[PDB]
Design an enzyme around this catalytic site. Structure first.
Site, short mmCIF file in Angstrom:
data_model
loop_
_atom_site.label_atom_id
_atom_site.label_comp_id
_atom_site.label_asym_id
_atom_site.label_seq_id
_atom_site.Cartn_x
_atom_site.Cartn_y
_atom_site.Cartn_z
N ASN A 113 7.34 -4.80 -6.80
CA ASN A 113 6.70 -4.46 -5.53
C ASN A 113 5.79 -5.63 -5.13
O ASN A 113 5.88 -6.70 -5.74
CB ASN A 113 5.95 -3.12 -5.61
CG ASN A 113 4.67 -3.20 -6.44
OD1 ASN A 113 4.09 -4.27 -6.62
ND2 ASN A 113 4.21 -2.06 -6.91
N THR A 126 2.79 -6.37 -5.74
CA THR A 126 1.90 -6.89 -6.78
C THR A 126 2.61 -7.97 -7.59
O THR A 126 1.97 -8.93 -8.05
CB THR A 126 1.32 -5.79 -7.72
OG1 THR A 126 2.36 -5.17 -8.48
CG2 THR A 126 0.57 -4.74 -6.92
N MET A 130 1.30 -9.89 -10.71
CA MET A 130 1.07 -8.72 -11.53
C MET A 130 2.36 -7.99 -11.86
O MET A 130 3.04 -7.45 -10.99
CB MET A 130 0.05 -7.77 -10.87
CG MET A 130 -1.23 -8.50 -10.48
SD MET A 130 -2.56 -7.48 -9.83
CE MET A 130 -2.79 -6.33 -11.19
N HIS A 145 2.61 3.94 4.37
CA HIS A 145 1.33 3.91 3.67
C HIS A 145 1.02 2.49 3.19
O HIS A 145 1.93 1.75 2.82
CB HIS A 145 1.40 4.83 2.46
CG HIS A 145 2.46 4.44 1.47
ND1 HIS A 145 3.80 4.68 1.69
CD2 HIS A 145 2.38 3.83 0.27
CE1 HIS A 145 4.50 4.23 0.66
NE2 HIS A 145 3.66 3.71 -0.22
N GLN A 191 8.79 5.38 -1.01
CA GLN A 191 8.61 6.48 -0.06
C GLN A 191 8.79 6.01 1.38
O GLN A 191 8.47 4.87 1.70
CB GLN A 191 7.21 7.08 -0.21
CG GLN A 191 6.93 7.70 -1.57
CD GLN A 191 7.70 8.98 -1.79
OE1 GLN A 191 8.17 9.61 -0.84
NE2 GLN A 191 7.84 9.38 -3.06
#
Length: 306
Positions: free
Chosen positions: A258, A260, A265, A142, A138
């Site tokens: 991403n 993580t 992860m 954020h 996006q």
């Protein structure tokens, strides 16, 4: 100042919205893996159902707080379709671009949220995917906050353990683990939140940024600029920046990576992939390289392009 009882507010907002259908949790199962070659710990989450501007007008039942501080800087939203329960988005109240750098108040606000959620024995991660190769879906700016798995030890931890907070200089570069395939930069943060203020955080980020930027901007001018992309990862114990070449990895897995991913992860959507990685945990390290740049540990950023 961070909303009082934030953690209970997140929790309660989350159970209520799961209850009445304002959010749906994607079913998943996770397990630990260990790279035999590099020793790096991984956390693999398996969410099969996944293979089958939301911040503009977010559903009110998902809005934990209209402004995370007194200022109209931030609202805190629940992720509508989380894998990790209570996974939350810190969204700029007014539109800003996700390609923009984190400000000092961004950092202090994120660190304070972490402190608030951590009870001052669960661990929280705050992260930022900046740019087209970061995994950012996006364009409305954020950050993201999520609980880390209970027993998981990310490599950044061992990297920073027993190493006091400091800042880079010409003698001392940011910590970087040489065993891992990919470029990354880490500073430990002080144990106590009394030693942490905006300026410390800001100086940590700027100096990490300067190392990350060298993969994009070229001081010899023998190359034109590339488009900046990086992951910022922030926990209470350390802060980390990862320069990113590609949002998605190459042939065997083709994982979307991403922030993580870079503390280890991994999210996989299908069981063939899950067994590939189980059999060979070292694939993750290989994927992380494809999505990043090769490890620079022991090098001056200045000699990258020279």
């Amino acid at each position: 100042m961070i909303e009082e009882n934030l953690k209970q507010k997140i929790h309660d907002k989350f159970v209520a919205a799961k209850k009445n259908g304002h959010l749906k949790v994607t079913h998943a199962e996770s397990k630990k893996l260990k790279d035999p070659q590099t020793t790096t710990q991984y956390w693999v989450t398996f969410a099969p159902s996944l293979a089958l501007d939301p911040f503009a007008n977010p559903d009110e039942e998902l809005v934990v707080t209209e402004d995370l501080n007194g200022d109209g800087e931030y609202k805190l939203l629940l992720n509508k379709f989380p894998v990790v329960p209570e996974h939350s988005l810190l969204v700029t109240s007014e539109f800003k671009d996700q390609r923009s750098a984190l400000t000092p108040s961004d950092l202090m606000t994120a660190y304070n949220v972490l402190c608030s959620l951590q009870g001052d024995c669960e661990r929280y991660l705050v992260f930022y995917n900046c740019g087209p190769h970061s995994g950012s879906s996006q364009d409305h700016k954020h950050l993201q906050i999520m609980q880390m798995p209970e027993k998981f030890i990310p490599f950044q931890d061992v990297l920073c353990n027993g190493k006091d907070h400091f800042l880079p200089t010409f003698n001392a570069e940011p910590l970087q683990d040489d065993k891992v395939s990919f470029a990354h930069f880490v500073l430990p943060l002080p144990e106590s939140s009394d030693q942490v203020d905006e300026d410390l955080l800001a100086m940590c980020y700027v100096s990490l940024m300067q190392r990350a930027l060298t993969f994009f901007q070229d001081w010899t001018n023998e190359s034109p600029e590339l488009t900046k992309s990086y992951n910022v990862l922030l926990t209470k114990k350390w802060i980390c920046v990862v320069p990113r070449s590609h949002a998605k990895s190459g042939p065997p897995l083709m994982l979307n990576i991403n922030s993580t991913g870079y503390c280890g992860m991994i999210l996989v959507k299908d069981r063939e992939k899950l067994e590939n990685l189980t059999e060979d945990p070292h694939l993750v390290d290989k994927s992380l390289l494809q999505c990043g740049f090769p490890n620079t540990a022991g090098q001056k950023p200045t000699e990258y392009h020279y």
